[PDB]
């Protein structure tokens, strides 16, 4: 009810009864009792209503025992989640994801292996915690196999650093891990953490890092003025040429509309051969290629 | 013939689309396939994405589901060329393994740069030999039978580059003391292209010292008539200036 | 935006299981899909010519009983069940 809900959660765990061996094997037997009983209830066969109510009571007892096992094992998941904390994900979120891993773990347990719950649960705790850390910690999502590759590379790079006391070349790390050096460069480029936009610059407080960046998508008024003047000048030089030449060039690059047209496409509405239409087209390109009608367009690029 | 090493794969864009694999030809295939291989050849080995190649082949309206079409064109290139000469990154296509002299375009820039360096150094024989080798590079019209307005763009660009290259060749031929083949080439090119002012200025310069004045000014009058009929403007002041100094017959530039 | 002619657009009505009806446009040349989301609640949209579930079962996640089936067999299920009934009778 106060601040620091980590303390509130730890007290919300409370004085749960820790389970010595016969207690949790009896609880697991009751789990099986409830689960097989509700499985029998799930069948569509008609039995006595009293037997159905008894099986429902067993199912409720099994659910209660499942709950009790959860509150018994919230201690171990808290003790294990703290091992992987302070790495971009919050401590209580790690606790909750480990709780997901533990409720996945206990569901897949059988009493045939006479082992304690710790050595079987810790595998799923570590697996779910590292999967959640791979999936949700970074702002850009990295798949779990990429995460395990990159942090294996990080740990062997740290081993190299503590071994020879010097920064290794990427070629050495590539050849000692049997991947290509360009792959190593790519994966350590991928393995980066973004910096927040709202970082203060220094003594000044109003000046932030966010106002220093520009945007390439911003429209430049000079560019738009150049574009509309290019359109106007192109229309003017089209009007400068002959009417038929203007008409044939207006369709070859589809200047009038959004679609260009081929020489065979315009040979029906106007009715000339491919030879003549391409000849007059190339004549128009040559005439516009003359240096007289170039300075009006050469600076326009 | 002296640069035909073993294992050499020669590529050519200045003439038509062809491949020389140690002296034997390779079937470059479809006209769109020829355009695709040329578009990879102009980029000196970029990984160029699929959409860019699709735009390069066709332009504004490529068929919608033709990405697999470009995929099977790439398959055609990979099975007709070496498996390792073409490599794909992130969906882009890239031709590598191109040594010196494999592309005629790279040799063309190399010869142009060497000719410019020899002109800077003042040499004439080596520069003449370099541009003689350069004029043997083009074989007919550049990019023979390839669609795409992109292909039209590098076609007109390479044609203009060839025009300035022949302008420089004719200019050094005039300054070193060559006139007969010079006026022959200028007449042939003005027969081919009638609306270039620079080549007709070169005609005036070449005929001005080779012993020909009447037909030079007749060609100039024809140029004025055609330029007034088709453009209705006045030619460049350097022209009128060149015709002017010609008129008082200065022997300074002999 | 001057002189550009827009593509022809057709109105296709999508209806969900909750009765929400909304109108959104499609291109004429574009294919009409019978599957779409709901603008109001995000439910599955139907009632566009022919439509169906198209295997909405989607391999539903295994329940505890499926895990139990791996852990224990048929005759084990029967014997554990009667053992638990015996525990009930002992406790009653």
Curated annotation (Swiss-Prot), chain A:
Keywords: DNA-binding, Sigma factor, Transcription, Transcription regulation. Coiled coil: none annotated. GO terms for cellular component: cytoplasm. Residues 263-282 bind DNA. A motif (Interaction with polymerase core subunit RpoC) lies at residues 93-96. It comes from the Bacteria. GO terms for molecular function: bacterial-type RNA polymerase holo enzyme binding; DNA binding; sigma factor activity. One of its GO terms (biological process) is DNA-templated transcription initiation. The keyword Transport does not apply. Residues 2-138 are annotated as: Binds RNA polymerase-binding protein RbpA. Belongs to the sigma-70 factor family. Homotrimer (Potential). interacts transiently with the RNA polymerase core complex. Interacts with RNA polymerase-binding protein RbpA via its sigma-2 region (residues 211-347) in a free form. This is RNA polymerase principal sigma factor HrdB. It comes from Streptomyces coelicolor (strain ATCC BAA-471 / A3(2) / M145). The lineage of its organism: Bacteria, Bacillati, Actinomycetota, Actinomycetes, Kitasatosporales.
UniProtKB/Swiss-Prot annotation, chain B:
Global regulatory protein for secondary metabolite formation. It comes from Streptomyces coelicolor (strain ATCC BAA-471 / A3(2) / M145). Residues 1-97 bind DNA. The gene is afsR. This is Regulatory protein AfsR. Coiled coil: none annotated. The chain holds residues 17 to 270 of 993 of the full protein. It comes from the Bacteria. The N-terminal and the C-terminal regions are independently capable of directing actinorhodin production. Phosphorylated by AfsK. Belongs to the AfsR/DnrI/RedD regulatory family.
